[PDB]
Symmetry: D2
């Protein structure tokens, strides 16, 4: 495969429906040597079997909010793997309240919690493992249209992803010198532990399926393959790029209609709403 | 004037070169009643005469990192002016170190400092004064190209302005229901207290000057008129807009060369570099 | 006003609901000396009173597809006004067929007509009057979100507008040196002659009203006021800018929902579609 | 490979340095059965051997300016290959003058030639071959940063590329209904027949090399692999996307400076210019 002999660190796995898992699965099929991290011993209960299924004996603890966990991580991968060719940064969080209602009511607390866990953590993770990154290494993070466009109740998480994307741009220039790449994969809505916690997510998912050019929701396999590509030398001439894997949803300037032309009606007014 | 009888709150005045003042100056000539805020007593020594120079007796204290200041602001204007038609958010801060070197070396501390003072403050300032805002009210903040593009050692400030512009988008939806507008004016480099205290600023300035389409730097007056417009009814149809006042610089995909056709040479190699 | 003693050419008026009219009306109210053109004698019947109504006795014939009309035009304003401070390029066309169905069915013939009348015309109009443009002159054209986002059946006109926004960018660099500004005002949907001829235009309009941040359609006055600003010295620091005047519509990444939060319902499913 | 048993049409091969060839090469190594096309007999002398080396006996004539060639194409692929899984649209032309001097001097003639060969041809190519496109088919075209940013003397080609990306957006919606993908690969400067004939091209190249984050120029293999990715099921979740293979150049907001921080100096002022 295109990741043969390549070593990579996967951060974000919570279960087999995780974006990072789809990416790890895809990376595995291409011969990569993987390493995984887990937030707490409860998630490790799921990250471990997942890890075994992908020929990986490297499982470490890493709660991005605990700076000492980073110090341990550096020592871990340097001992167990010597070096890293790629990193997957698939982590984000914000209090449940922050994602409902408006951005106005956001508490300074929820703001910082979402900024730190979802943005700064990319900086700390990358700086921490910087001296262990081989030349040509690739750093991939996960974003969402909500960064540049308004998406119902995404709120502060929207402000985070915008900063996240900017960081990707600045990190690509900081590491470009040493031939290292940085990108963001902008996936469309998809069912995962984090999303199943968001209010009326089934709706966001229906609006995308019905109004997206390909008229479908992206699979975990599709997101995994786009990621794998971005992390492989297949894309060594690609950096500081925000790559959409959303069934083409990003192009829409309004609700789809194209299929119906009698008088032109919204596809929404005909599917799951009549 | 297009602001006669209109009441606005100006946040961000440090001296008479501040962007916030230019916009204030312009709104003044249009008949707006002005109100100013200062960070500390030291700054009040400069904000005071200015307010007086522009007919304003309503001067209040406001350090965005102090939440109790916000409740006072409220009571202060609710008592003095009763209502607000437009708010100017001209604030941004980050430690000196964070704006030099690389984004990678940024600390969790400077990060949270950059994000709070420069982004969350717009949220608290707005949500606080919300019930004092008349229908048709306009909220303007200031950003910089660094938000979506790499600019020399802008580092963490670039992440801030990226969330800032995204916050402008969500606030516009949050407050649009109530007929209120939220925009951002992305001004080009311009010499002010805060900018003069930034490494090699002389260079960013000259580069924009030579490479900009209008072949010059933007004046404080031009930024002020751009803002006055965004804050006047003249733009009642505008919202969630990042308005560029940069002498067209933002359109360049490389250094200028145009006038000289002989064999095409960078204007920079001909201007102040021979 | 901010256009006192300023002379500008207004191109594109068909009746009193035209965008070029709103722009004209607004510029008139600011002391501008206007001049108008007309496609044919039938439109001249409406461009004449309108022209009188705005203290303008300069009315010339101009069909952008007729190269000779441009030669007359130059001679006309050189005699009648000596010079131009601003220009309004408000012209667009494409066969009815091309604006329905898909982009795939567009004939080579419709493609060219749409590109010529809608894009090249800006190039010819500007290049022709270039010798009569005073320093600080401002060139304003009109575009629509369909340039960068897909909009129902906008098709080839979507391709035109995108080339047009890129044209705006290249012309700003070409004329930038001579202190001349070039911008585009991207207006939101609004009822006019050309639009009343578009299939199911009412829907585009309804959708914007319900889903736009300000929850209303933009008025002809708001478009004019924006254009006037773009054409006045008030924006002497703005160039190569695509300025949106759509009630904040461009920020939306999906249909509005906000006002209803029980389970978060689409405002569309509650307004003009129960 | 990821295109094993996948049949595609390669349009635009001029020699072993063409972008279309690199993509073909990368696709050939992924198991695809290829088919090529040539403009005139003078190019068939370079396409035939390339087609042979890549295992292809399907070499057809196609001058996008001639509509009859499209009818033959259809018949040629329907008879020789039965159906198509992917199409490569790597064609663009504009008169030599148009690409030098200013966009202002462009003639109506050259405007129409640029638009037609570089934009309309994507529309005819896809609509003609449409009945031969299998579900999940992928359509890829090539663009350049000049489409949305000013690039020296790119001029009218910049307008074409902007319409081209817009067409990619509308075509993606027209063919998505049938599960077909449409994307654009925006490559960075690279040595080809067409580019070699461009004014001051070495400069554009050195400028991207020094200012690009990965500090190099992209290779034909990288552009090739990026396109093969876009054209394979590996990217079945991506559509209407403009994908940048430019060593990350697009992220730059100004010239590079990074590595040097004595007073912060341009990398350009130190490399190939002292
Ligand atoms: N699922 C979607 O529809 C979608 C769409 C676009 C972007 N994304 C992005 O994908 C990433 C998340 O993937 P997901 O959607 O599969 O959710 P997920 O729950 O599967 O993964 C998120 C992971 O982050 C971990 N995490 C949370 N806080 C942490 C902290 N303090 N320290 C260390 N780890 C922590 C969680 O344990 C979890 O494993 C996020 O960046 C998210 O913004 C998701
Ligand atoms: N100067 C430029 O070239 C430029 C370019 C683009 C954007 N901007 C933006 O303009 C705004 C500031 O204007 P400026 O550049 O004229 O700088 P300035 O020095 O004139 O103003 C900065 C202001 O921020 C205030 N401030 C900082 N921390 C604060 C806090 N804790 N609480 C309350 N106030 C605080 C200061 O009191 C000061 O008045 C910022 O948002 C900045 O990002 C400036
Ligand atoms: N009305 C809207 O909702 C809307 C939205 C976005 C952008 N626009 C843009 O506004 C501009 C026109 O404004 P409008 O909507 O008031 O339409 P309108 O019908 O009022 O004006 C269009 C003008 O173009 C002129 N024209 C057409 N072909 C011509 C030719 N061959 N030679 C000379 N003139 C010709 C017509 O005579 C007409 O006066 C167009 O560029 C259009 O793309 C309109
Ligand atoms: N070379 C670069 O640095 C660069 C950068 C960005 C985008 N591109 C794009 O790549 C594509 C071309 O590839 P290239 O750069 O390798 O150049 P190239 O010389 O290798 O290919 C250009 C091809 O276009 C064909 N062509 C021109 N007119 C035609 C017509 N009327 N009918 C049929 N074919 C015609 C020519 O035969 C030629 O093969 C173009 O779309 C170009 O805009 C190139
Ligand atoms: O960014 C996301 C975008 C979408 Cl559409 C769905 C899930 C996402 O991811 C998250 C969103 C909110 C929280 Cl609190 C935590 C995570 Cl992991
Ligand atoms: O955002 C800015 C952009 C530019 Cl080009 C110049 C000055 C700016 O303003 C600041 C920069 C850094 C800090 Cl700590 C505080 C402020 Cl007010
Ligand atoms: O660009 C436009 C966008 C909108 Cl929403 C409405 C009208 C517009 O303008 C036109 C569209 C098509 C044709 Cl044939 C002629 C014109 Cl004047
Ligand atoms: O689009 C391009 C961009 C670059 Cl940087 C280099 C070459 C390109 O391709 C062309 C440019 C002009 C003409 Cl006439 C024909 C072609 Cl194929």
């Amino acid at each position: 495969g295109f990741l043969k002999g390549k070593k990579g660190l996967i951060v974000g796995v919570a279960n087999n429906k995780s974006i990072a898992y789809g990416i790890a699965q895809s990376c595995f099929n291409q011969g990569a040597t993987l390493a995984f991290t887990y937030l707490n011993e409860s998630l490790e209960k799921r990250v471990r079997p997942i890890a075994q299924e992908l020929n990986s004996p490297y499982v470490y603890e890493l709660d991005v909010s605990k700076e000492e966990h980073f110090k341990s991580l550096y020592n871990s991968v340097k001992k167990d793997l010597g070096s890293l060719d790629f990193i997957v940064h698939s982590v984000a969080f914000a209090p449940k309240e922050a994602l409902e209602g408006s951005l106005l009511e956001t508490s300074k607390s929820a703001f910082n919690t979402a900024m730190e866990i979802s943005v700064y953590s990319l900086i700390e993770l990358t700086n921490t493992l910087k001296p262990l990154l081989n030349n040509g290494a690739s750093v991939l993070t996960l974003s969402y249209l909500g960064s540049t466009k308004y998406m119902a109740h995404y709120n502060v998480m929207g402000l985070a992803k915008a900063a996240l994307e900017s960081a990707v741009r600045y990190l690509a220039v900081d590491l470009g010198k040493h031939h290292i790449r940085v990108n963001a994969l902008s996936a469309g809505p998809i069912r995962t532990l984090a999303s199943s916690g968001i209010a009326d997510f089934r709706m966001i998912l229906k609006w995308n399926e019905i109004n997206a050019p390909l008229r479908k929701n992206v699979s975990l396999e599709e997101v995994g393959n786009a990621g794998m590509y971005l992390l492989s030398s297949l894309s060594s001439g690609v950096s500081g790029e925000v790559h959409f894997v959303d069934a083409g949803y990003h192009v829409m300037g309004m609700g789809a209609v194209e299929e119906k032309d009698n008088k032109a009606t919204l596809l929404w007014d005909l599917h799951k709403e009549q």
